[PDB]
Amino acid sequence: QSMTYQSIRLTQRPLSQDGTTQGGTVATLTLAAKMGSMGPAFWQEFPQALSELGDARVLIVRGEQVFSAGLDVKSNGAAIVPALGKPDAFKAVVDEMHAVTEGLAALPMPVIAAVHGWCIGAGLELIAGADLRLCSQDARFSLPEVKLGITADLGGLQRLPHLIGRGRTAHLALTGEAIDAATAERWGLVTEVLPDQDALFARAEALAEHLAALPAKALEGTKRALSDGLPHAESLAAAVRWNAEHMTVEALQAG
Amino acid sequence: QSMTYQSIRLTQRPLSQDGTTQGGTVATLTLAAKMGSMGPAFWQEFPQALSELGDARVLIVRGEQVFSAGLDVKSNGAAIVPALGKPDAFKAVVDEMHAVTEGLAALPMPVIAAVHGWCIGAGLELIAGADLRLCSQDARFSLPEVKLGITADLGGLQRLPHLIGRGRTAHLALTGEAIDAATAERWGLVTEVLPDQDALFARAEALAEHLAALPAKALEGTKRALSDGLPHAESLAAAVRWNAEHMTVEALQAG
Amino acid sequence: QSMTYQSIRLTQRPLSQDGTTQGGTVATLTLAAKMGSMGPAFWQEFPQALSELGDARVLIVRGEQVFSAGLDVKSNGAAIVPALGKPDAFKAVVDEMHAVTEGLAALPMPVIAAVHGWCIGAGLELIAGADLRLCSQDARFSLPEVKLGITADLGGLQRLPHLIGRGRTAHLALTGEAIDAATAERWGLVTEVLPDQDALFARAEALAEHLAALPAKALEGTKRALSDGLPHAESLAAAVRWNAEHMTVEALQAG
């Protein structure tokens, strides 16, 4: 069962297609605009698609020709340019874009970004909020915002240092130049590199099947702890409280 | 001179066995339960052993057949299951386990974890609190708690991202699958990989000898600064204050 | 046009030597004391040189025979020893040294550290505050302060974990032993290793030319965001505000 939006496609595959029960799905969100570009429709539709994921155990995010060329400068310029030099108006504009990056990062389930070819700018900021990142050999990653006189402000400068370190983030962000798949894996931006797009998509599906087999609330608590940004003792105490609420005798016995 | 507990063995080797002076030791704590498992005795005895380290300059933590299989599900179930769904009671239970992980992390001297074979779950959380980690070629590391419906709550989700990055921690914690020694070294979880268990233990002893030769309070201040979790300026100011109190003319001249 | 100080040399190269306009420069600061050592003159002169950089688009920091042997123990002892055991007096002494490390870290433009040969102690702490680090094959990096009974307190223990991770910083800081160029690159301390000193200096110049071609305020905002140490949402909101103030139609069109 698929839902076509203007800028994206969302498909959900029932994990059991037999049985008389309502269970979970694996969701796949495809960036479907030209070169996976992000225009004004994207900022409106992506959060709508996220609201459809109440039943989903895992979300895969992927592209078509490439993953994403990032922000479409031309089509977003209509909203951005009139707000330049107006901090409150400018914030309001970027708030719509944060609905995507912060919305994805806040999803309670595992999110797998499966990247082939170009992953540029807002594309890279988006995957920075995913839980697991996989790519193909041909994948190339960059944050070229500086070349346009832009400071990356969709969460890349905050999230990327947790993944690859501050120095390596500074390399990407200050030079604006791309890194290849082998480098991304060395740096910890991705945890697997596959031969090609088809191998990538197959592996993402398999990884999703693996995660969907695991207890949903343990995955959620783990994600919460890693993303909480709380001091050690507070983050620790919150994980303990999560287990108090969500551990079951049954999950112990089954595992 | 050795102390036998039920779950662990603690041995301390005087650094000078000649001389009429009371100096320092190298302490070795061996996880001595079956497969280095951690049951109710472990949580009681491990902090007791730590209280014996007033004279020790370095602590080595190691296993026997393997490093540690982690929590013994069966023997801890007696305490855990009755506390499920009761946040204050559950906290009290896990507090006893934190006495080990937080206790180890708080030790004023260098702690070397020397890992061979399996290092699983609470085993991995424990070494995350050590200062230096060494392993053999055959070592395998995992955080499989998710498979039991558990969110790792002994400090692994807080400590591991400082060592290997958030993305790599998410890989371990969400998939629950193991990584090998070569991967651990690439990721920064360990800083040396040795051919085998005997080579590992010998190297740990040698590294301990090296550290024990260094000024104790400089090692302590360094550990304090790295672990303080304070904002930059506060952490910096505290290191300066530590030097004001602990630097000596003699240590400058000797070095 | 060069400025000779006692401990350093500062040269600034106009980016356009044609034209009737006052533009930007590439600045090169050379550690010019014996083995790039840092004595009392260094702490006074280095901040003076930084005050000369109002027109500079990029700063390169480099050495001569080596990058830096770090603190000259003998010549700083006159100020340090009388302040031992006196927290307020000791702070005052180290404040003069922080004027260098914190001053460099606060510079609004990109700072490139170009390291050949030894980079030791305060030398390593200094480059930890740079934006990009390049080295030659022969470069060796260490934090041997522990051997002198010193806890590194010029920002290395705070900055290095952001670059290479806490475990790897603990290796350097606790053992006091050096790492080579290949290891530094693997660890993320540097992002390029060049064959030799001449190749290093040439590449640093080229990288500076590349960065100087980019919009100055986007580079500044990027540096601010990466270094702010603020919680996620605050750091994010501050980047958005920076763009509101500094993005231009012209920079979009040009890029």
Task: For residue B91, give how far its alpha carbon lies from the nearest alpha carbon of chain A (Å).
Answer: 7
Q: Which residue has the tokens 């290191």?
A: B239
Q: Which residue has the tokens 């424990």?
A: B126
Residues of A in contact with C225 (CB under 8 A): 151-153, 157-158
Instruction: Count interface pairs A-C at CB distance under 8 A.
Output: 131
| Cα–Cα distance, C186 to A187 (Å, whole number) | 9
| Cα–Cα distance, A248 to B2 (Å, whole number) | 41
CB A131 within 8 A of CB A153: no
3-state secondary structure C160-216: HHHHHCHHHHHHHHHHCCCEEHHHHHHHCCCCEEECCHHHHHHHHHHHHHHHHCCCH
CB A90 within 8 A of CB C239: no
Residues of B in contact with A217 (CB under 8 A): 149
Q: Which residue has the tokens 């100055």?
A: C216
| Cα–Cα distance, B88 to B83 (Å, whole number) | 8
> Which member of C165, C214, C235 has the closest CB to residue A147?
C214
What are φ and ψ of residue B84, in 5° steps?
Answer: -60, 135
Experimental method: X-ray
CB A146 within 8 A of CB C214: yes
CB A125 within 8 A of CB A169: no
> Which member of A131, A186, A244 has the closest CB to residue B174?
A131
| Cα–Cα distance, B145 to B160 (Å, whole number) | 15
**Domain range list for chain B:** 1-212, 213-255
The amino acid occupying position B44 is Q
B187 Cβ contact partners less than 8 Å away, ≥ 6 residues apart: A188, B163, B164, B165, B168, B179
Task: For residue A3, give how far its alpha carbon lies from the nearest alpha carbon of chain C (Å).
Answer: 32
CB B104 within 8 A of CB B127: no
Burial (0-12, 13-18, 19+ Cβ within 10 Å), A16: exposed
DSSP state, A71? B
Tell which CATH architecture fits domain A1-212: Alpha-Beta Complex (3.90)
Residues of B in contact with A160 (CB under 8 A): none
Task: For residue B84, give how far its alpha carbon lies from the nearest alpha carbon of chain C (Å).
Answer: 33
Residues of C in contact with B240 (CB under 8 A): 90-91, 94, 153
Residues of C in contact with B226 (CB under 8 A): 157, 161, 166, 169-170, 173
| Cα–Cα distance, C255 to B121 (Å, whole number) | 50
| Cα–Cα distance, A222 to A110 (Å, whole number) | 10
3-state DSSP call for residue B168? Answer: helix
CB C239 within 8 A of CB C221: yes
CB contact under 8 A, C246 and A149: yes
Q: What is the resolution of this structure in A?
A: 1.9
CB contact under 8 A, B243 and C173: no
CB contact under 8 A, B221 and C85: no
CB A211 within 8 A of CB A219: yes
